[PDB]
Coordinates of C-alpha atoms and ligand atoms in Angstrom, one line a residue:
Chain M
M1 CA 45.1 -14.8 -23.2
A2 CA 41.9 -16.8 -23.5
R3 CA 41.7 -18.8 -26.7
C4 CA 38.5 -21.0 -26.1
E5 CA 40.4 -24.3 -26.3
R6 CA 38.4 -27.5 -25.9
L7 CA 39.7 -28.9 -22.6
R8 CA 40.8 -32.5 -22.8
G9 CA 43.7 -35.0 -22.5
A10 CA 46.9 -33.9 -20.8
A11 CA 45.8 -30.3 -20.7
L12 CA 42.7 -31.3 -18.8
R13 CA 44.7 -33.3 -16.3
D14 CA 47.1 -30.4 -15.8
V15 CA 44.3 -27.7 -15.4
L16 CA 42.3 -29.8 -12.9
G17 CA 45.3 -31.1 -11.0
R18 CA 46.6 -27.6 -10.3
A19 CA 43.2 -26.2 -9.4
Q20 CA 42.5 -25.9 -5.6
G21 CA 38.8 -25.4 -6.2
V22 CA 36.0 -25.0 -8.7
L23 CA 33.2 -22.4 -8.7
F24 CA 30.1 -23.6 -10.6
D25 CA 27.1 -21.8 -11.9
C26 CA 24.0 -24.0 -11.4
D27 CA 21.3 -23.5 -14.1
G28 CA 22.6 -24.7 -17.5
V29 CA 25.6 -26.3 -15.8
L30 CA 24.6 -28.8 -13.2
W31 CA 21.0 -29.2 -14.5
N32 CA 18.4 -27.9 -16.9
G33 CA 15.2 -27.6 -14.9
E34 CA 14.5 -30.8 -13.1
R35 CA 17.0 -32.8 -15.2
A36 CA 20.5 -33.2 -14.0
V37 CA 23.3 -33.1 -16.6
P38 CA 24.3 -36.7 -16.8
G39 CA 27.6 -37.3 -15.0
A40 CA 27.4 -34.0 -13.1
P41 CA 26.8 -35.5 -9.7
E42 CA 29.7 -37.9 -10.2
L43 CA 32.0 -35.0 -11.1
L44 CA 31.2 -33.3 -7.8
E45 CA 31.8 -36.5 -5.8
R46 CA 35.2 -37.0 -7.6
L47 CA 36.2 -33.4 -6.9
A48 CA 35.5 -33.8 -3.2
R49 CA 37.4 -37.1 -3.1
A50 CA 40.4 -35.4 -4.8
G51 CA 40.4 -32.7 -2.1
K52 CA 39.3 -29.9 -4.4
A53 CA 36.8 -27.4 -3.0
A54 CA 33.5 -26.8 -4.8
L55 CA 31.4 -23.6 -4.4
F56 CA 28.2 -22.7 -6.2
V57 CA 27.5 -19.2 -7.4
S58 CA 24.0 -18.4 -9.0
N59 CA 22.4 -15.2 -10.1
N60 CA 19.0 -16.8 -9.4
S61 CA 17.2 -14.7 -6.8
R62 CA 14.1 -16.8 -6.4
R63 CA 15.2 -19.1 -3.5
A64 CA 16.5 -18.4 -0.1
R65 CA 19.4 -20.6 1.0
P66 CA 17.3 -23.4 2.6
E67 CA 15.2 -23.9 -0.4
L68 CA 18.2 -23.5 -2.8
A69 CA 19.8 -26.5 -1.1
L70 CA 16.8 -28.7 -1.8
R71 CA 17.2 -28.5 -5.6
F72 CA 20.8 -29.8 -5.3
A73 CA 19.8 -32.8 -3.2
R74 CA 16.9 -34.1 -5.3
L75 CA 19.0 -33.9 -8.5
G76 CA 21.8 -36.1 -7.1
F77 CA 24.2 -33.5 -5.6
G78 CA 24.6 -34.9 -2.1
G79 CA 26.7 -34.0 0.9
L80 CA 26.6 -30.2 0.2
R81 CA 26.8 -27.7 3.0
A82 CA 24.6 -24.6 2.9
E83 CA 27.8 -22.5 3.3
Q84 CA 28.8 -23.7 -0.2
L85 CA 25.8 -22.0 -1.9
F86 CA 25.8 -18.4 -2.9
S87 CA 22.9 -16.7 -4.8
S88 CA 22.3 -13.1 -5.8
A89 CA 19.5 -13.0 -3.2
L90 CA 21.9 -13.9 -0.4
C91 CA 24.5 -11.5 -1.6
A92 CA 22.1 -8.6 -2.3
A93 CA 20.9 -9.0 1.3
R94 CA 24.5 -8.8 2.6
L95 CA 25.3 -5.8 0.4
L96 CA 22.2 -3.9 1.6
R97 CA 23.1 -4.6 5.3
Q98 CA 26.6 -3.3 4.5
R99 CA 25.6 -0.1 2.5
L100 CA 22.1 1.1 3.5
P101 CA 22.5 4.8 4.3
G102 CA 20.7 6.6 7.0
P103 CA 21.3 6.7 10.7
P104 CA 21.7 3.8 13.1
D105 CA 19.0 5.2 15.4
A106 CA 16.3 4.9 12.6
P107 CA 17.1 2.0 10.2
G108 CA 15.9 2.5 6.7
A109 CA 13.6 0.2 4.7
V110 CA 14.1 -1.6 1.4
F111 CA 11.4 -1.5 -1.3
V112 CA 11.6 -4.9 -3.0
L113 CA 10.5 -5.9 -6.5
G114 CA 10.7 -9.6 -6.1
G115 CA 9.3 -12.8 -4.6
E116 CA 9.0 -14.4 -1.2
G117 CA 12.3 -16.3 -1.4
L118 CA 14.2 -13.0 -1.9
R119 CA 12.2 -11.3 0.8
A120 CA 13.0 -14.1 3.2
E121 CA 16.7 -13.8 2.5
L122 CA 16.6 -10.0 3.2
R123 CA 14.8 -10.4 6.5
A124 CA 17.2 -13.1 7.6
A125 CA 20.0 -10.5 7.1
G126 CA 18.2 -8.1 9.4
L127 CA 16.7 -5.8 6.8
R128 CA 13.3 -4.2 7.2
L129 CA 11.1 -4.2 4.1
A130 CA 8.7 -1.5 2.9
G131 CA 5.2 -2.7 3.5
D132 CA 6.1 -4.9 6.5
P133 CA 4.1 -3.9 9.6
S134 CA 4.8 -0.5 11.0
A135 CA 5.5 -0.1 14.7
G136 CA 2.5 0.7 16.8
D137 CA 0.6 3.7 15.4
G138 CA 3.9 5.1 14.0
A139 CA 4.3 6.0 10.4
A140 CA 6.0 3.9 7.7
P141 CA 9.8 4.1 7.8
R142 CA 11.8 6.0 5.2
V143 CA 12.6 3.9 2.1
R144 CA 16.4 4.1 1.7
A145 CA 16.8 1.5 -1.1
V146 CA 15.0 0.0 -4.1
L147 CA 16.0 -3.6 -4.8
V148 CA 15.1 -5.1 -8.2
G149 CA 15.0 -8.9 -8.4
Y150 CA 13.2 -11.6 -10.3
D151 CA 9.6 -10.3 -9.9
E152 CA 6.8 -12.4 -11.5
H153 CA 4.4 -9.8 -10.1
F154 CA 6.1 -6.8 -11.7
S155 CA 3.6 -4.1 -12.6
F156 CA 3.4 -0.5 -13.8
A157 CA 2.2 0.5 -10.4
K158 CA 5.3 -1.0 -8.7
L159 CA 7.5 0.6 -11.3
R160 CA 5.9 4.0 -10.6
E161 CA 6.3 3.5 -6.8
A162 CA 10.0 2.5 -7.2
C163 CA 10.5 5.8 -9.1
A164 CA 8.8 7.8 -6.3
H165 CA 11.3 6.4 -3.8
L166 CA 14.3 7.0 -6.2
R167 CA 13.3 10.7 -6.4
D168 CA 15.4 10.9 -3.3
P169 CA 19.0 10.9 -4.6
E170 CA 20.2 9.2 -1.4
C171 CA 17.9 6.2 -1.9
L172 CA 20.0 3.4 -3.4
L173 CA 19.1 1.5 -6.5
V174 CA 20.3 -2.1 -6.4
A175 CA 19.6 -5.0 -8.8
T176 CA 20.2 -8.7 -8.0
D177 CA 21.4 -9.4 -11.5
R178 CA 21.1 -8.2 -15.1
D179 CA 20.3 -11.5 -16.8
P180 CA 17.9 -10.5 -19.6
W181 CA 15.9 -13.7 -19.9
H182 CA 16.1 -17.4 -19.1
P183 CA 15.2 -20.6 -21.1
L184 CA 12.5 -22.9 -19.9
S185 CA 12.0 -26.6 -20.3
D186 CA 9.3 -26.3 -23.0
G187 CA 11.6 -24.1 -25.2
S188 CA 9.9 -20.8 -24.2
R189 CA 11.7 -18.1 -22.2
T190 CA 10.9 -16.0 -19.1
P191 CA 12.0 -12.4 -18.7
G192 CA 15.0 -11.9 -16.4
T193 CA 15.8 -9.3 -13.7
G194 CA 17.8 -7.4 -16.3
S195 CA 14.6 -6.6 -18.2
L196 CA 12.9 -5.3 -15.1
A197 CA 16.1 -3.3 -14.1
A198 CA 16.2 -1.8 -17.5
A199 CA 12.6 -0.4 -17.0
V200 CA 13.4 0.9 -13.5
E201 CA 16.7 2.5 -14.7
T202 CA 15.0 4.1 -17.7
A203 CA 12.0 5.5 -15.8
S204 CA 14.1 6.8 -12.9
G205 CA 17.1 8.0 -14.8
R206 CA 19.4 6.1 -12.5
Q207 CA 22.1 3.4 -12.9
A208 CA 21.6 0.4 -10.7
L209 CA 24.3 -1.2 -8.5
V210 CA 24.4 -4.8 -9.7
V211 CA 25.1 -7.5 -7.0
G212 CA 25.3 -10.6 -9.1
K213 CA 27.7 -11.9 -11.8
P214 CA 29.5 -10.3 -13.6
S215 CA 30.0 -7.8 -10.8
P216 CA 33.1 -8.3 -8.7
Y217 CA 30.9 -7.8 -5.6
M218 CA 29.7 -11.4 -6.0
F219 CA 33.3 -12.5 -5.6
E220 CA 33.7 -10.4 -2.4
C221 CA 30.5 -12.0 -1.1
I222 CA 31.6 -15.6 -1.7
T223 CA 35.1 -15.0 -0.2
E224 CA 34.0 -13.0 2.9
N225 CA 34.4 -16.2 4.9
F226 CA 36.1 -18.6 2.4
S227 CA 39.7 -18.2 1.4
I228 CA 39.9 -19.1 -2.3
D229 CA 42.9 -18.1 -4.5
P230 CA 41.4 -17.0 -7.8
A231 CA 44.7 -17.9 -9.5
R232 CA 43.9 -21.5 -8.4
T233 CA 40.2 -21.5 -9.0
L234 CA 38.2 -22.6 -12.1
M235 CA 35.0 -20.7 -13.0
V236 CA 32.6 -22.9 -14.8
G237 CA 29.4 -21.5 -16.4
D238 CA 27.1 -21.4 -19.4
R239 CA 26.8 -17.7 -20.1
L240 CA 29.6 -15.6 -21.7
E241 CA 28.3 -12.2 -20.5
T242 CA 27.9 -13.2 -16.9
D243 CA 30.0 -16.3 -15.9
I244 CA 33.0 -15.9 -18.3
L245 CA 33.2 -12.1 -17.9
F246 CA 33.0 -12.6 -14.1
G247 CA 35.9 -15.1 -14.2
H248 CA 38.1 -12.7 -16.2
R249 CA 37.4 -9.8 -13.8
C250 CA 38.3 -12.0 -10.8
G251 CA 41.5 -13.5 -12.3
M252 CA 40.1 -17.1 -12.6
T253 CA 40.5 -19.6 -15.3
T254 CA 37.2 -19.8 -17.1
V255 CA 35.4 -22.8 -18.6
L256 CA 32.3 -22.5 -20.8
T257 CA 30.0 -25.5 -20.7
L258 CA 27.6 -25.9 -23.7
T259 CA 24.6 -27.4 -21.9
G260 CA 23.1 -23.9 -21.3
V261 CA 22.5 -20.5 -22.8
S262 CA 25.7 -19.5 -24.7
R263 CA 26.9 -21.2 -27.8
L264 CA 30.4 -22.0 -29.0
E265 CA 29.9 -19.8 -32.1
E266 CA 29.3 -16.8 -29.9
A267 CA 32.5 -17.3 -28.0
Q268 CA 34.5 -17.7 -31.2
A269 CA 32.9 -14.5 -32.5
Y270 CA 34.0 -12.5 -29.5
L271 CA 37.5 -13.9 -29.9
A272 CA 37.6 -12.8 -33.5
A273 CA 36.4 -9.3 -32.5
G274 CA 39.2 -9.2 -29.8
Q275 CA 36.8 -9.0 -26.9
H276 CA 38.9 -11.3 -24.8
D277 CA 37.0 -10.7 -21.5
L278 CA 34.0 -12.5 -23.1
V279 CA 36.2 -15.4 -24.4
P280 CA 36.4 -18.6 -22.2
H281 CA 39.9 -20.0 -21.6
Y282 CA 38.4 -23.4 -22.2
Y283 CA 35.1 -25.1 -23.1
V284 CA 33.5 -28.5 -22.7
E285 CA 30.4 -30.0 -24.1
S286 CA 29.2 -30.7 -20.6
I287 CA 30.9 -30.7 -17.2
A288 CA 30.9 -34.6 -17.3
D289 CA 33.9 -34.2 -19.7
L290 CA 35.9 -32.8 -16.7
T291 CA 35.8 -35.9 -14.6
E292 CA 38.4 -37.8 -16.6
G293 CA 41.0 -35.2 -15.6
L294 CA 40.9 -36.3 -11.9
Chain I
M1 CA 24.9 25.4 -36.9
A2 CA 22.5 25.6 -33.9
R3 CA 23.8 27.9 -31.2
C4 CA 20.9 28.0 -28.8
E5 CA 20.2 31.7 -29.2
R6 CA 17.4 33.4 -27.2
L7 CA 15.0 34.4 -30.0
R8 CA 13.8 38.0 -29.7
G9 CA 13.7 41.4 -31.4
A10 CA 14.5 41.7 -35.1
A11 CA 15.7 38.0 -35.3
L12 CA 12.4 36.9 -34.0
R13 CA 10.5 38.9 -36.6
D14 CA 12.7 37.5 -39.4
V15 CA 12.4 33.9 -38.3
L16 CA 8.7 34.0 -37.8
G17 CA 8.1 36.1 -40.9
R18 CA 9.9 33.7 -43.2
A19 CA 8.3 30.6 -41.6
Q20 CA 5.3 29.1 -43.6
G21 CA 4.2 26.9 -40.6
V22 CA 5.0 25.8 -37.1
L23 CA 4.9 22.3 -35.6
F24 CA 4.2 22.3 -31.9
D25 CA 4.7 19.6 -29.3
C26 CA 1.8 19.8 -26.8
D27 CA 2.7 18.7 -23.3
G28 CA 5.1 21.2 -21.8
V29 CA 4.6 23.6 -24.7
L30 CA 0.9 24.5 -25.0
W31 CA 0.0 23.4 -21.5
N32 CA 1.2 21.6 -18.3
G33 CA -1.6 19.3 -17.3
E34 CA -4.9 21.2 -17.2
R35 CA -3.1 24.6 -17.1
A36 CA -2.6 26.4 -20.4
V37 CA 0.7 28.3 -20.8
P38 CA -0.5 31.9 -20.5
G39 CA -0.5 33.5 -23.9
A40 CA -0.3 30.2 -25.8
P41 CA -3.9 30.4 -27.2
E42 CA -3.3 33.9 -28.4
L43 CA -0.1 32.8 -30.2
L44 CA -2.1 30.2 -32.2
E45 CA -4.8 32.8 -33.0
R46 CA -2.2 35.2 -34.3
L47 CA -0.4 32.6 -36.3
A48 CA -3.6 31.7 -38.1
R49 CA -4.4 35.3 -38.7
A50 CA -0.9 35.7 -40.2
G51 CA -1.6 32.9 -42.6
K52 CA 0.9 30.5 -41.0
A53 CA 0.0 26.9 -40.7
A54 CA 0.0 25.2 -37.3
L55 CA 0.3 21.4 -36.8
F56 CA 0.6 19.5 -33.5
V57 CA 2.9 16.5 -33.1
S58 CA 2.7 14.5 -29.8
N59 CA 4.3 11.3 -28.6
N60 CA 1.4 10.9 -26.2
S61 CA -0.2 7.5 -27.1
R62 CA -3.1 7.7 -24.5
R63 CA -5.8 9.4 -26.6
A64 CA -7.3 8.6 -30.0
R65 CA -7.8 11.7 -32.2
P66 CA -11.4 12.6 -31.1
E67 CA -10.4 12.7 -27.4
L68 CA -7.1 14.4 -28.2
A69 CA -9.0 17.3 -29.8
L70 CA -11.0 17.8 -26.5
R71 CA -8.0 18.8 -24.5
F72 CA -7.1 21.5 -27.0
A73 CA -10.6 23.1 -26.9
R74 CA -11.0 23.3 -23.1
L75 CA -7.6 24.9 -22.6
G76 CA -8.4 27.8 -25.0
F77 CA -7.1 26.5 -28.4
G78 CA -10.1 26.9 -30.5
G79 CA -10.9 26.5 -34.2
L80 CA -8.6 23.4 -34.7
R81 CA -9.3 20.7 -37.2
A82 CA -8.7 17.1 -36.3
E83 CA -6.4 16.9 -39.4
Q84 CA -4.0 19.2 -37.6
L85 CA -3.4 16.7 -34.7
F86 CA -0.8 13.9 -34.9
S87 CA 0.0 11.5 -32.1
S88 CA 2.2 8.5 -31.8
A89 CA -1.0 6.4 -31.4
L90 CA -2.3 7.6 -34.8
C91 CA 1.0 7.2 -36.5
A92 CA 1.7 3.8 -35.0
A93 CA -1.7 2.6 -36.4
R94 CA -0.8 3.9 -39.8
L95 CA 2.7 2.3 -39.8
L96 CA 1.3 -1.1 -38.8
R97 CA -1.3 -0.9 -41.6
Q98 CA 1.6 -0.1 -44.0
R99 CA 4.1 -2.7 -42.7
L100 CA 2.3 -5.7 -41.1
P101 CA 3.7 -8.8 -42.8
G102 CA 1.8 -11.9 -43.7
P103 CA -0.6 -12.6 -46.5
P104 CA -3.6 -10.5 -47.6
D105 CA -5.8 -13.6 -47.4
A106 CA -5.2 -13.9 -43.6
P107 CA -4.5 -10.6 -42.0
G108 CA -2.3 -10.7 -38.9
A109 CA -3.1 -9.5 -35.5
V110 CA -1.3 -6.9 -33.2
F111 CA -0.5 -7.7 -29.6
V112 CA -0.8 -4.3 -27.8
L113 CA 0.7 -3.2 -24.6
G114 CA -1.4 -0.1 -24.0
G115 CA -4.7 1.5 -23.2
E116 CA -8.1 1.9 -24.7
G117 CA -7.3 5.1 -26.6
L118 CA -4.4 3.5 -28.4
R119 CA -6.5 0.4 -29.1
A120 CA -9.3 2.6 -30.6
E121 CA -6.9 4.3 -32.9
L122 CA -5.6 0.9 -34.1
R123 CA -9.0 -0.5 -34.8
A124 CA -10.0 2.7 -36.7
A125 CA -7.0 2.1 -39.0
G126 CA -8.4 -1.4 -39.8
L127 CA -6.1 -3.4 -37.6
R128 CA -7.2 -6.5 -35.7
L129 CA -5.9 -6.9 -32.1
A130 CA -4.9 -10.0 -30.3
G131 CA -7.6 -10.9 -27.8
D132 CA -10.4 -9.4 -29.8
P133 CA -13.2 -11.9 -30.6
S134 CA -12.2 -14.8 -32.8
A135 CA -14.3 -15.6 -35.9
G136 CA -16.9 -18.3 -35.2
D137 CA -15.3 -21.4 -33.7
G138 CA -12.1 -20.6 -35.5
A139 CA -8.7 -20.3 -33.7
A140 CA -7.0 -17.1 -32.7
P141 CA -5.2 -15.4 -35.6
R142 CA -1.4 -15.3 -35.9
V143 CA 0.2 -12.4 -34.0
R144 CA 2.4 -10.6 -36.5
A145 CA 3.3 -7.5 -34.4
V146 CA 3.9 -6.5 -30.8
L147 CA 3.2 -2.8 -30.1
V148 CA 4.5 -1.2 -27.0
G149 CA 2.7 2.0 -25.9
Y150 CA 1.9 3.8 -22.7
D151 CA 0.5 0.9 -20.6
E152 CA -0.6 1.7 -17.0
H153 CA -1.5 -2.0 -16.8
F154 CA 1.9 -3.4 -17.8
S155 CA 2.8 -6.6 -16.0
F156 CA 5.3 -9.4 -16.0
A157 CA 2.7 -11.7 -17.5
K158 CA 2.2 -9.3 -20.5
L159 CA 6.0 -8.9 -20.9
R160 CA 6.3 -12.7 -21.0
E161 CA 3.5 -13.0 -23.6
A162 CA 5.1 -10.3 -25.7
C163 CA 8.3 -12.3 -25.7
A164 CA 6.5 -15.5 -26.7
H165 CA 5.1 -13.7 -29.8
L166 CA 8.6 -12.2 -30.6
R167 CA 10.1 -15.7 -30.7
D168 CA 8.9 -15.6 -34.3
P169 CA 11.6 -13.4 -36.0
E170 CA 9.0 -12.3 -38.6
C171 CA 6.8 -10.8 -35.8
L172 CA 7.4 -7.0 -35.7
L173 CA 8.4 -5.1 -32.6
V174 CA 7.1 -1.5 -32.6
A175 CA 7.1 1.2 -29.9
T176 CA 5.0 4.3 -30.0
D177 CA 7.8 6.4 -28.5
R178 CA 10.9 6.1 -26.2
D179 CA 10.0 8.9 -23.8
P180 CA 11.5 7.5 -20.5
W181 CA 9.2 9.3 -18.0
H182 CA 6.8 12.3 -17.7
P183 CA 6.3 15.0 -15.1
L184 CA 3.0 15.3 -13.3
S185 CA 1.3 18.3 -11.8
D186 CA 2.1 17.3 -8.2
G187 CA 5.8 17.1 -8.9
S188 CA 6.0 13.4 -9.2
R189 CA 6.7 11.4 -12.4
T190 CA 5.1 8.6 -14.3
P191 CA 7.1 6.0 -16.2
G192 CA 7.1 6.5 -20.0
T193 CA 6.7 4.1 -22.9
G194 CA 10.5 4.1 -23.2
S195 CA 10.8 2.3 -19.9
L196 CA 8.4 -0.4 -21.0
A197 CA 10.1 -0.7 -24.4
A198 CA 13.4 -1.2 -22.6
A199 CA 12.0 -4.2 -20.8
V200 CA 10.5 -5.7 -23.9
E201 CA 13.7 -5.2 -25.9
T202 CA 15.9 -6.6 -23.1
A203 CA 13.8 -9.7 -22.5
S204 CA 13.3 -10.5 -26.2
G205 CA 16.8 -9.5 -27.4
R206 CA 15.1 -7.3 -30.1
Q207 CA 15.4 -3.7 -31.1
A208 CA 12.1 -1.9 -31.5
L209 CA 11.0 0.2 -34.5
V210 CA 10.1 3.6 -32.9
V211 CA 7.2 5.5 -34.5
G212 CA 7.3 8.7 -32.5
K213 CA 9.7 11.6 -32.3
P214 CA 12.7 11.6 -32.8
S215 CA 12.1 9.0 -35.5
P216 CA 11.8 10.5 -39.1
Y217 CA 8.8 8.2 -39.5
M218 CA 6.7 10.8 -37.5
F219 CA 7.6 13.4 -40.2
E220 CA 6.5 11.0 -43.0
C221 CA 3.2 10.5 -41.1
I222 CA 2.4 14.1 -40.7
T223 CA 3.3 15.0 -44.3
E224 CA 1.5 12.1 -46.0
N225 CA -1.4 14.4 -46.7
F226 CA 0.0 17.9 -45.8
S227 CA 2.7 19.6 -47.9
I228 CA 5.1 21.3 -45.5
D229 CA 8.5 22.5 -46.5
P230 CA 10.9 21.6 -43.6
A231 CA 13.2 24.5 -44.6
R232 CA 10.2 26.8 -43.9
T233 CA 8.9 25.1 -40.8
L234 CA 9.7 25.8 -37.1
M235 CA 9.7 22.8 -34.7
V236 CA 8.8 23.9 -31.2
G237 CA 9.2 21.6 -28.2
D238 CA 10.3 21.2 -24.6
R239 CA 12.5 18.0 -24.9
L240 CA 16.0 18.0 -26.4
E241 CA 16.2 14.3 -27.0
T242 CA 12.9 14.1 -28.8
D243 CA 11.7 17.4 -30.2
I244 CA 15.0 19.1 -31.0
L245 CA 16.7 15.9 -32.3
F246 CA 13.5 15.4 -34.5
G247 CA 13.8 18.9 -35.9
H248 CA 17.5 18.5 -36.9
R249 CA 16.8 15.1 -38.5
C250 CA 14.0 16.6 -40.6
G251 CA 15.8 19.9 -41.5
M252 CA 13.6 22.2 -39.5
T253 CA 14.6 25.2 -37.5
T254 CA 14.2 24.2 -33.8
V255 CA 13.0 26.2 -30.9
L256 CA 13.2 25.0 -27.3
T257 CA 10.6 26.3 -24.9
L258 CA 11.5 26.2 -21.2
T259 CA 8.0 25.5 -19.8
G260 CA 8.6 21.7 -19.9
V261 CA 11.1 18.9 -19.3
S262 CA 14.4 20.1 -20.7
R263 CA 16.5 22.8 -19.1
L264 CA 18.6 25.5 -20.8
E265 CA 21.7 24.3 -18.9
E266 CA 21.3 20.9 -20.6
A267 CA 21.1 22.4 -24.1
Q268 CA 24.3 24.5 -23.4
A269 CA 26.1 21.4 -22.2
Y270 CA 25.3 19.5 -25.4
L271 CA 26.6 22.5 -27.4
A272 CA 29.9 22.5 -25.4
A273 CA 30.2 18.8 -26.0
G274 CA 29.7 19.4 -29.8
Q275 CA 26.5 17.3 -29.9
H276 CA 24.8 19.8 -32.3
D277 CA 21.8 17.5 -33.1
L278 CA 20.7 18.0 -29.5
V279 CA 21.2 21.8 -29.5
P280 CA 18.2 24.0 -30.4
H281 CA 18.7 26.7 -32.9
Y282 CA 16.7 29.0 -30.6
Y283 CA 15.0 29.0 -27.2
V284 CA 12.3 31.0 -25.5
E285 CA 11.1 31.1 -21.9
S286 CA 7.6 30.2 -23.1
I287 CA 5.9 30.2 -26.5
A288 CA 4.1 33.5 -25.5
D289 CA 7.4 35.2 -26.3
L290 CA 6.9 34.3 -30.0
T291 CA 3.8 36.3 -30.5
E292 CA 5.5 39.7 -30.7
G293 CA 7.3 38.6 -33.8
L294 CA 4.1 38.6 -35.8
Ligands
UK9_1 O1 16.5 -23.6 -16.9 C1 16.9 -22.4 -16.5 C2 16.1 -21.6 -15.7 C3 16.4 -20.3 -15.4 C4 15.7 -19.4 -14.5 C5 16.4 -18.4 -13.8 C6 15.6 -17.5 -13.1 C7 14.3 -17.5 -13.0 C8 13.6 -18.5 -13.7 C9 14.3 -19.4 -14.5 O2 17.6 -19.8 -15.8 C10 18.5 -20.6 -16.6 C11 19.7 -20.0 -17.0 O3 19.9 -18.7 -16.7 C12 20.6 -20.7 -17.7 O4 21.8 -20.2 -17.9 C13 20.3 -22.0 -18.1 C14 19.1 -22.6 -17.8 C15 18.1 -21.9 -17.0
UK9_2 O1 2.4 17.1 -18.0 C1 2.9 16.2 -18.7 C2 2.3 14.9 -18.9 C3 2.8 14.0 -19.7 C4 2.4 12.6 -19.9 C5 2.6 11.9 -21.1 C6 2.2 10.6 -21.3 C7 1.5 10.0 -20.3 C8 1.2 10.6 -19.1 C9 1.6 11.9 -18.9 O2 4.0 14.2 -20.4 C10 4.6 15.5 -20.3 C11 5.7 15.6 -21.1 O3 6.2 14.6 -21.8 C12 6.3 16.9 -21.1 O4 7.3 17.1 -22.0 C13 5.8 17.9 -20.3 C14 4.7 17.7 -19.5 C15 4.1 16.5 -19.5
CL3 CL1 8.8 -4.0 -0.4
CL4 CL1 -3.7 -7.1 -27.7
MG5 MG1 23.6 -20.4 -15.9
MG6 MG1 6.6 17.7 -24.5

């Protein structure tokens, strides 16, 4: 079982050598804000040269795929294909396309708590949004899902409207992620989607379907068109309750990096409490410590 | 132990006859919106004539005491003294006066998520509010508590600011109540303070101190200046998880009325699960069914 071992030396060479691919979280792992983790671009170059696949899995719902790719490029992570990038915005759009109830003759609409990047991803997946223009003089379509994402314009009015839609038990409640907060460059924090989802769940008396990590649905989304063997894939992240739990649920070897949110002391506390699904198999100070294993 | 018995006949005469006073919740008990429960004003008149004390305990944080009294009067509940009326706004103001940390030479300030009635109650208790005018050219005072109440102007910006203040571990987090939602006359619902508190707690990683029912603090507040013997007091409410739990925690005989939020089926389910602190001792269809016992 996971023992939170510092990955180095011969063990590092064996773990990386056997791996066919690596799944990376982005924030806290590849970069912090507009600052790349030193050595992280070189790791990705070396992984590609070694024939090992790299995929990127982020709970960040702020950017549609084209703008998500831009952040990678300007921080040194070159040569990446858009098909390597998975966000909770992209995967929530796909889940809604797959699960929106209602008849095919009258597609439902999605009431979105979130920003323009998320809305763009939803429309690109063919979804119609509450508040988009209605057809001719016709009435507004029936709202068949509420989607909670990262919404810097969240308000009591929007919360009340979400509850009005959720009065219909057949209306879905979906959240992009349950991350409670995020650290910012200046040392402050911003509320996360999990805090907004908590309000919607509490006021509506519903439980949300969560798209992003640690939900296994995120793994279905990334593998819909890419064959990855979880027994041969490393999951690298900075958050115990999202990245590491995700890896355990999917059968992946997990690596905690310490350049982000979770601390080594927290991982060791979970291990002492016996909560092994929150314990990384391995940790590194930063992902630059993985490059020597190639 | 509580068995959720319909209170009537000789048992009703014995329960009411032995009681020295009755504590009533307001919404769902005395009235629904601007409609008094028929027979409720007459019950209060008869209780007073019988020499039994009546007190009113509400989690509603929207009205300061003077405006709270107005609703009673226009719905038929005459002859009431302001000292009989206790709200979570009044009791949160008193708790903050009693517990605000910091030195006496520099009083702290309270950052309030809530409306003008709540703010008025706080100022009347001597508290200074974040955003009130600063003295001369001096800087803004240190925020030493965040108070979450019913805030129809809640926003992401206000949530983020609350978290900035709560970064200081010595800053208190207080909530007026944890009621998750409330029913409206038209059949819709409005989000409750509990939904906003859930967001603040989740984004800040804190647990709030809750003033209102079912917290025992509400009982300390009402009895600070009124001697009531809980063994001789009936607690009458419409919500299992707030009024009935409150009564059990305080040692009062509890009566569920069915003119509000909780349903008889829910009470019976708690009893079958053995969750006796959520089980009323007695229930009535409406509080008008209590009058015959006098
Ligand atoms: O710098 C960061 C920014 C963010 C962020 C996510 C959504 C909206 C706004 C900001 O999230 C982070 C994160 O979750 C980490 O694990 C580590 C770092 C960050
Ligand atoms: O008609 C009602 C209105 C409200 C209300 C409380 C705070 C803000 C806005 C509305 O709360 C209720 C309640 O909690 C009940 O138990 C029963 C009825 C009501
Ligand atoms: Cl929308
Ligand atoms: Cl304030
Ligand atoms: Mg991260
Ligand atoms: Mg009530």
